[PDB]
């Protein structure tokens, strides 16, 4: 309690809370992230383990962020992987390509070529990349950026109402600690 996160400093209370897509008894958690964001990369093992530990207690999703036109292909990539059902399999290698191999995967052809080395059929991937369904999800993700007033990554949103992230806590461990506190406060009907 004396060490509890401080509202307005360690997390932000949104003036316009957003609809929650989680069912009763689950806390919704959203991570806005960008494949090219170093803190998002570093945070992956931390948030993966925490989400897996919560299990059915939460409904977790990621939303890709393209702050610039040049990075819209990274949001298309995110939704194309999900459409193919290979996200869990290849996403570590995608992060590795960008952050360690200097392959920024900025075009659909570079993505397809890389993903083929990971066992993804290029025609299937490019069909997903260019599909109307993925284009719809990308346009939606940009509307979500606006609706949650997101101006940095990674940003974690709890129950459509509480935002945290290293912009707030100045550390990834602090982000995880605030997230855990927020979810517990929502479960206990304190937030
Ligand atoms: C890790 C790498 O940073 C980048 C991340 C995404 C993009 Br796109 C371009 C560069 C670096 N040069 O240290």
UniProtKB/TrEMBL annotation:
Its main location: periplasm. It holds the Pfam family DSBA. Keywords: Disulfide bond, Periplasm, Redox-active center, Signal. Disulfide bonds join 37-40, 37-40. One of its GO terms (molecular function) is disulfide oxidoreductase activity. PROSITE patterns: THIOREDOXIN_1, THIOREDOXIN_2. One of its GO terms (cellular component) is periplasmic space. It is found in: Periplasm. Residues 1-184 form the Thioredoxin domain. InterPro entries: DSBA-like_thioredoxin_dom, DsbA/DsbL, Thiol_disulfide_DsbA, Thioredoxin-like_sf, Thioredoxin_CS, Thioredoxin_domain. Belongs to the thioredoxin family. DsbA subfamily. This is Thiol:disulfide interchange protein. It comes from Burkholderia pseudomallei (strain K96243). The lineage of its organism: Bacteria, Pseudomonadati, Pseudomonadota, Betaproteobacteria, Burkholderiales.
């Amino acid at each position: 309690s004396p060490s509890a996160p401080v509202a307005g400093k360690d997390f932000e209370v949104m003036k316009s809370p957003q609809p929650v897509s989680a069912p009763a008894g689950k806390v919704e958690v959203i991570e806005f992230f960008w494949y090219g964001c170093p803190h998002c990369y570093e945070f992956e093992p931390t948030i993966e383990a925490w989400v897996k530990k919560q299990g059915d207690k939460i409904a977790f999703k990621r939303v890709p962020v393209a702050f610039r036109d040049d990075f819209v292909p990274h949001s298309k990539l995110f939704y194309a992987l999900a459409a193919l059902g290979v996200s869990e399999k290849v996403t570590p290698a995608v992060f590795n390509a960008i952050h360690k191999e200097k392959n920024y995967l900025l075009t659909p052809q570079a993505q397809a070529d890389f993903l083929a080395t990971q066992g993804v059929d290029k025609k299937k991937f490019l069909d997903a990349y260019n599909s109307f369904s993925v284009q719809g999800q990308v346009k939606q993700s940009a509307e979500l950026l606006k609706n949650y007033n997101i101006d940095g990554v990674p940003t974690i949103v709890v129950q459509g109402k509480y935002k945290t992230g290293p912009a707030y806590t100045n550390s990834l461990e602090g982000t995880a600690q605030v997230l855990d506190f927020l979810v517990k406060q929502v479960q206990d009907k304190k937030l």
